[PDB]
Amino acid sequence: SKKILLPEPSIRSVMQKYLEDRGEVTFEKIFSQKLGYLLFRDFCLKHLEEAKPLVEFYEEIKKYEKLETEEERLVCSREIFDTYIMKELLACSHPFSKSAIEHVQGHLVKKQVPPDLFQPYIEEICQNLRGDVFQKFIESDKFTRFCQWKNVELNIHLTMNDFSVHRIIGRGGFGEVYGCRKADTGKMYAMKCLDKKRIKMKQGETLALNERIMLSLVSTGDCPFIVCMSYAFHTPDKLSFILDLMNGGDLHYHLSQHGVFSEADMRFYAAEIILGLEHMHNRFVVYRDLKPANILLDEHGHVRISDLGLACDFSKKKPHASVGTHGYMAPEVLQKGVAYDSSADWFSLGCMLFKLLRGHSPFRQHKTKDKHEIDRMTLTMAVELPDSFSPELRSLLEGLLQRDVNRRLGCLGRGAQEVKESPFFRSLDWQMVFLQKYPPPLIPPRGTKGIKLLDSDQELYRNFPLTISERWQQEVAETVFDTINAETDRLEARKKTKNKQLGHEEDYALGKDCIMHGYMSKMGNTQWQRRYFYLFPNRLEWRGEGEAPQSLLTMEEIQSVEETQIKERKCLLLKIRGGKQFVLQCDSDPELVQWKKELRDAYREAQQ
Numbered sequence: 001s002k003k004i005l006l007p008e009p010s011i012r013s014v015m016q017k018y019l020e021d022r023g024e025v026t027f028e029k030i031f032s033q034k035l036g037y038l039l040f041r042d043f044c045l046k047h048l049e050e051a052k053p054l055v056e057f058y059e060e061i062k063k064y065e066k067l068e069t070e071e072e073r074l075v076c077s078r079e080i081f082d083t084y085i086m087k088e089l090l091a092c093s094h095p096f097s098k099s100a101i102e103h104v105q106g107h108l109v110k111k112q113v114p115p116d117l118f119q120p121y122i123e124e125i126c127q128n129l130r131g132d133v134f135q136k137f138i139e140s141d142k143f144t145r146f147c148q149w150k151n152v153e154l155n156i157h158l159t160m161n162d163f164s165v166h167r168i169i170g171r172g173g174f175g176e177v178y179g180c181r182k183a184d185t186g187k188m189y190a191m192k193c194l195d196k197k198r199i200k201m202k203q204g205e206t207l208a209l210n211e212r213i214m215l216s217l218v219s220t221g222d223c224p225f226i227v228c229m230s231y232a233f234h235t236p237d238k239l240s241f242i243l244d245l246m247n248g249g250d251l252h253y254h255l256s257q258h259g260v261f262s263e264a265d266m267r268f269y270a271a272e273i274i275l276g277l278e279h280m281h282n283r284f285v286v287y288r289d290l291k292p293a294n295i296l297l298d299e300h301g302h303v304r305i306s307d308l309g310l311a312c313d314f315s316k317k318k319p320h321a322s323v324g325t326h327g328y329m330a331p332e333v334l335q336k337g338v339a340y341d342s343s344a345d346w347f348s349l350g351c352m353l354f355k356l357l358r359g360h361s362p363f364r365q366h367k368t369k370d371k372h373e374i375d376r377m378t379l380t381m382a383v384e385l386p387d388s389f390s391p392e393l394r395s396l397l398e399g400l401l402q403r404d405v406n407r408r409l410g411c412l413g414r415g416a417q418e419v420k421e422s423p424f425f426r427s428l429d430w431q432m433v434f435l436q437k438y439p440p441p442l443i444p445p446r447g448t449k450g451i452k453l454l455d456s457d458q459e460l461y462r463n464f465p466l467t468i469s470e471r472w473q474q475e476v477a478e479t480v481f482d483t484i485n486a487e488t489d490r491l492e493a494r495k496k497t498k499n500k501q502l503g504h505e506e507d508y509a510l511g512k513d514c515i516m517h518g519y520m521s522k523m524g525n526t527q528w529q530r531r532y533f534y535l536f537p538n539r540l541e542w543r544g545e546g547e548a549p550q551s552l553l554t555m556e557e558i559q560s561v562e563e564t565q566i567k568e569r570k571c572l573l574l575k576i577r578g579g580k581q582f583v584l585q586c587d588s589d590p591e592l593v594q595w596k597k598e599l600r601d602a603y604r605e606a607q608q
Contacts, residue, residue, distance in 0.1 A: 002183050004480060005486045006148050006150045007588070008495075012519035015147035016591045017598070025138070027130040034473040035149055035481065043142035044133075051133055055095075057084045061118045070430065073113045077347060080118070081108055096124055099241055145485070150478075155588040156467055157249070158240075163191065167169035170249070172307075174198045176443040185479045187228060188268050190246060192240035198386065200457055201449060207309045208239065210466030212464055214308040215223045215241065217283055219468055223438060225276030227296065229307045230475065232466035236452065239461070248306060248444025251356070258442060261356045263393060265441035266385075267424070270353055273434040275307045277349065278416035284315040288324050288333070290348035292355060301440030314341055315363075326371045328352055334375055346410035350400030357389075362401065381405060396424040476516065508548070509534055516598055522584035535598065538606050553582065555606035561599050572596065 019025050030036040041059070044051035052169055052502060060080055067073045085104065086534070100120045107117055122585040137143055166182040173192045181188055195295045199208045215229040217455035231242040248254075251269070255261070273295065289310040296306050312319050318339040322329070326344075330347035354362045363377035377383075382401050385394060399422065402408035409418050419431055432438060499505070509517050517537045521528045522542075538556075541549040557577040563574045564583075570592060572584035586592040 004152070004484065006484065007151050008302065008401040009144050009148070009492060011113070011151055011518070011591075013149055013516050014591050014594055015151055015515060016143075018594045019147075019150070021594070021597070027134050030146070031126075033320070034470065034477055038477060038481070039142050039146050040137060041088070043137050043140050047142075048133065048136060049138065051089070051129070053084065054128060054133075058122070060084070061122060061125075064118060065115045067115070068435070068437075070113060073115065074111065076110055077113055077117065082336075095128060096121065098123055100588050145488075148488075153472060153590055154466070154590050157465070158231060159235060161527060165191065169247070174204060177243075181245075182475070185475055187479065188245045188476050189366065190227075190243045192241040192243055194241075195447065196234075196237050196239060196457070196461070197451060197453060199239070200453065201451060205457075205460060209460065209464075210311075211241075211307075212466075214285060214311045214313070215368060216466060216468060217285055217313060218280060219307065220283070220470060221279070222474075223271055223276070223279050223304075224302070225304050227304050228471070229466075229468060230465060230471035231468070234461055234464060236458075239464075244304070245298075246296040246306075247298040247299045248301075248447060250293045250306075251289075251303070254297070254416070254442055254444070255292055255356060255359075260359055263390065263579065264375060266353060266356045267428075268438055269356060269431075270349075271425070271428060272303050272436075272437075273305065273349065273352075273417070274419055275433060277342075277345050280305075280311075281345070281416055284313060286310060286314055286319075286340075287311045287345050288341055288343055288348065290352050291325050291328055292352055297442070297444055299444065301443045302436050324348065326374050327355075327364050329378070331379060332405060334378065340405070343405055343411050346400060346408060350397055352401075354397060357478040363451060385490065390424075392423045392426070393474075395421045403556055406592050461558070512536065515602065516594070517596065518591055519587060520595070523583045535602065537602050540599075555603045558599075558603045561596065561603065572599075574599075585608065 016025075024030070030042060036563050041055050041142060044055045057080075062290045064073060064080065067076060067395070081104065085094065085101065103120050104117065107113075108208050114339055134444050139262050162182060162184065164179045164183055165178050167179050169177040169179055169190060172192060172194070175198060176193055178191045178193065179188065180191050184361070198203055199421045209470060214231060215232070217334065220224055227246060228244045231240075233240050233242075273290070277287065277290075287308070287310075288303060289307060290305075294306045295303050297303055310323050312323075318341060319371050320337050320339050322333055322336075322346075324333060328348040330344035330353035360366075361374070363374045363381075365377075380400065385397065389397075396409075397466045399409045400419075406412055409422065410416065410420070419425075485526040513536075513538060517532070517534050519530070520533050531542045531544065534543075538554065540553045540555070542551055543549040553574075553576075559575040559577060562575075564571050566583070566585075569585065570587075570589070572592070573596060574582040574584065576582060584595065586595065
């Protein structure tokens with residue numbers, strides 16, 4: 001039932017080639033993936049000799065980067081020097097280039113402590129690990145394990161069965177949002193449900209789909225300033241966005257509940273919002289709907305940006321459209337034909353910030369539905385501002401709300417950083433907000449239609465299911481990764497004992513110029529018998545567990561390998577030379593695609 005299960009170590013041969021095909025057996029691709037790294041260091045620290053320091057050194061370097069003030073890092077660098085450079089130089093066990101050493105030297109004697117410092121060393125730890133070291137990881141038991149997880153990573157479809165849904169969190173336009181738990185692990189995520197029916201009604205299919213695309217373009221890398229996507233899946237009628245769990249409402253609500261905000265309080269909000277934008281702009285994405293009600297709060301009082309639906313990718317094609325809520329739009333958006341980038345966000349920002357101090361949108365001097373009056377106030381006027389603000393806040397707002405593209409903050413120069421520097425933000429260390437180490441101003445208190453659905457609409461929702469690799473990994477690693485590794489280490493050492501004194505099956509695949517060996521099911525009228533197959537470049541054998549392979553299906557009698565769908569599963573159809581037909585069922589999607597290819601290659605070359 002509930003708990004997560006690991007597929008056995010024999011999965012190996014199949015996985016290894018699956019990966020290999022996609023060229024994902026590089027040092028790099030594997031160090032980057034959070035479990036890839038974690039398993040690599042576990043192999044280095046326990047089993048290999050010359051690996052030990054290289055890793056402990058790396059891990060210590062990461063901690064240094066992560067430190068905050070000038071004086072914690074000052075100390076940390078010293079120890080590193082002594083321990084991993086100096087003392088290692090005494091017994092010349094230091095394998096690093098001349099130029100490298102001398103960078104760190106010339107710094108530590110001058111007390112200068114940037115977090116980048118240990119970089120040129122970083123790169124050479126990679127270096128030494130990339131070559132030989134990595135190859136022994138390849139053959140290692142820890143690689144075997146890596147496969148095990150990655151398998152399961154790739155085999156992960158979702159239904160509501162995979163969620164224990166708790167409470168309602170407030171509606172969207174196309175349906176509601178809940179809070180829940182993934183019973184896999186037991187993280188707390190939120191669930192945005194869009195009902196397809198509704199999306200067909202409002203012609204928001206363009207939105208619904210775009211919301212998807214954006215969400216995936218953003219969530220890579222870790223952010224705390226964006227509602228972040230961790231999965232995407234659908235049941236016949238419901239869309240599902242597994243999202244970051246965000247509780248105490250939107251800024252809009254709290255603006256109405258608290259009232260206008262003190263200068264210092266806006267600052268905090270501003271900061272975070274800014275950081276958020278930056279992240280988006282770095283993936284070449286423009287939000288466009290920067291507005292009070294799109295900013296959510298967690299229990300602890302910080303914030304994130306939310307509805308990406310109305311956002312865009314400008315990587316190749318810059319937009320000319322008019323998308324946003326009418327109070328907060330830059331001149332560029334509003335105009336018919338003019339192309340813009342991030343710029344429109346920066347304006348939108350100002351407007352929203354303004355609102356947090358004053359109660360209204362900057363151009364909204366009370367016209368309810370008359371959009372054109374908010375639009376012309378934008379174009380002829382950059383609005384005059386009272387004496388209650390500091391001369392410092394005054395120049396931050398006046399520089400943001402320039403009706404020119406060129407003259408405004410966040411445009412012609414460094415972009416996101418231009419804003420970070422204007423004298424309003426003089427009293428902040430910018431990494432401090434990035435850690436969310438500041439205190440928040442507001443800790444939030446203790447909280448239809450009968451139309452049917454085509455097939456033509458349903459095919460707009462394949463190529464939507466998504467599992468953003470990285471996210472999943474994280475989740476695992478905070479909670480179960482560790483005690484599921486040692487539990488299976490227990491199940492695999494018990495599997496080796498039940499076979500020895502009963503005479504182990506002198507493995508007969510590790511002796512021949514074989515090609516692959518994985519688990520499958522086959523048919524004879526309607527049962528499914530589960531068997532273990534062995535693929536040589538001219539035959540395909542099989543044994544039951546206790547015997548030596550009695551049966552074979554040879555390559556030259558195979559006429560066409562195809563895929564079918566037997567009760568909504570994917571399966572393999574093997575046409576034979578008497579007219580005969582034979583069927584294969586796999587467990588894990590990759591497994592399937594690898595048989596599919598390797599059979600199709602072996603029979604093409606066995607018939608040559």
